[PDB]
Amino acid sequence: ENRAQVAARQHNRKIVEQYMHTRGEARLKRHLLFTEDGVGGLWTTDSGQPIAIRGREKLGEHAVWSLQCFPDWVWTDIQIFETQDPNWFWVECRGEGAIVFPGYPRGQYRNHFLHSFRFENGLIKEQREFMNPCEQFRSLGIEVPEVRRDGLPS
Amino acid sequence: ENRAQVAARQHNRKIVEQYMHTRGEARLKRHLLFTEDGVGGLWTTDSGQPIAIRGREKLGEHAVWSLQCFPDWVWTDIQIFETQDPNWFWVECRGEGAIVFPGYPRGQYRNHFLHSFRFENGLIKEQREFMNPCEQFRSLGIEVPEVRRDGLPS
Numbered sequence: 001e002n003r004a005q006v007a008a009r010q011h012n013r014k015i016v017e018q019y020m021h022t023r024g025e026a027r028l029k030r031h032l033l034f035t036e037d038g039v040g041g042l043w044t045t046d047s048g049q050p051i052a053i054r055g056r057e058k059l060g061e062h063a064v065w066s067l068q069c070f071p072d073w074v075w076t077d078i079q080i081f082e083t084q085d086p087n088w089f090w091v092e093c094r095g096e097g098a099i100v101f102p103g104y105p106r107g108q109y110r111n112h113f114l115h116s117f118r119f120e121n122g123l124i125k126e127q128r129e130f131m132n133p134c135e136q137f138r139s140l141g142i143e144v145p146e147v148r149r150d151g152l153p154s
Numbered sequence: 155e156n157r158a159q160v161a162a163r164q165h166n167r168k169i170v171e172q173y174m175h176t177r178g179e180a181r182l183k184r185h186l187l188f189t190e191d192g193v194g195g196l197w198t199t200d201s202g203q204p205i206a207i208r209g210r211e212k213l214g215e216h217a218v219w220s221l222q223c224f225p226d227w228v229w230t231d232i233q234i235f236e237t238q239d240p241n242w243f244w245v246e247c248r249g250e251g252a253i254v255f256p257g258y259p260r261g262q263y264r265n266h267f268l269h270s271f272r273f274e275n276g277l278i279k280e281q282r283e284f285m286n287p288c289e290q291f292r293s294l295g296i297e298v299p300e301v302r303r304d305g306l307p308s
């Protein structure tokens with residue numbers, strides 16, 4: 001059993017590395033790292049609900065939009081964490097690039113990210129990314145509310 | 155080496171569990187789980203800069219404010235992740251409780267959290283928590299900006 005778990009973790013780690021280093025036109029094929037029913041998306045948004053992309057085919061379609069809205073995106077400072085589950089990895093990283101959202105001025109977006117990767121039969125079953133949406137608001141020129149801190153320790 | 159690493163990870167996991175289960179008046183002693191120079195705090199805020207508490211003594215002072223502003227806070231749905239580093243753990247969880255911030259109406263705050271725990275010689279050297287500040291804005295009655303999605307795929 002341990003030999004099967006070690007083998008799974010070593011293989012899955014390679015897929016995480018491949019995912020995090022996928023850049024440029026290769027992003028059009030990143031959905032091939034998922035199971036057919038795999039899910040990916042952004043779990044931290046202004047609405048409080050994830051923006052989840054369901055299915056390898058929808059993931060491929062999203063990559064088209066991704067390359068338009070984030071045309072030179074790179075992940076940096078990548079740290080991959082294996083876990084006691086050979087099929088579950090976490091990644092801490094930063095990400096940066098131009099942001100070209102419909103109806104907003106072109107901007108530069110930089111943020112800190114956590115990624116969750118869960119695997120099934122050698123491919124990604126669920127990818128989730130977590131960030132602070134306030135930094136994306138800033139990149140789009142959107143005003144960020146400020147919690148008043150006068151009454152708080154400083 | 156393996157034995158020293160396994161020993162570290164088993165002990166450190168117990169500290170993570172104790173931290174995540176600490177509620178009520180026990181929060182006044184949670185800083186004893188840190189090194190003398192340990193750091194804890196919130197890495198995801200409206201400013202984009204962490205609110206970091208530096209030093210075991212300042213962590214204990216912050217616990218006083220924590221119990222005023224988050225008087226009944228509970229961490230729920232706790233999933234602890236060991237990593238390949240016996241001194242580095244991640245936690246996925248939820249948190250809930252009343253939020254009583256100076257100069258805001260009393261609210262009910264619920265959010266999803268990720269915690270990072272790094273250890274040194276049996277105690278926490280660095281704790282960081284990551285969430286989506288938009289849900290804390292909502293609990294405080296603060297208006298959350300909306301990214302316009304008309305131009306985006308749906």
Ligand SMILES: O=C(c1ccc(Cl)cc1)c1c(-c2ccccc2)sc2cc(O)ccc12
Binds near residue numbers: 044
């Ligand atoms: O960047 C994103 C985003 C980034 C990656 C993924 Cl997988 C999903 C959404 C994003 C939106 C989006 C929706 C559909 C297509 C493209 C972007 S809508 C929105 C709203 C937010 O408050 C924060 C982020 C986003």
Ligand SMILES: O=C(c1ccc(Cl)cc1)c1c(-c2ccccc2)sc2cc(O)ccc12
Binds near residue numbers: 152201
């Ligand atoms: O909840 C927090 C918070 C919670 C935990 C920690 Cl360790 C730090 C800040 C918090 C603030 C705070 C600062 C000092 C004392 C108490 C609250 S100020 C602020 C501002 C934000 O945009 C989001 C959260 C917070």
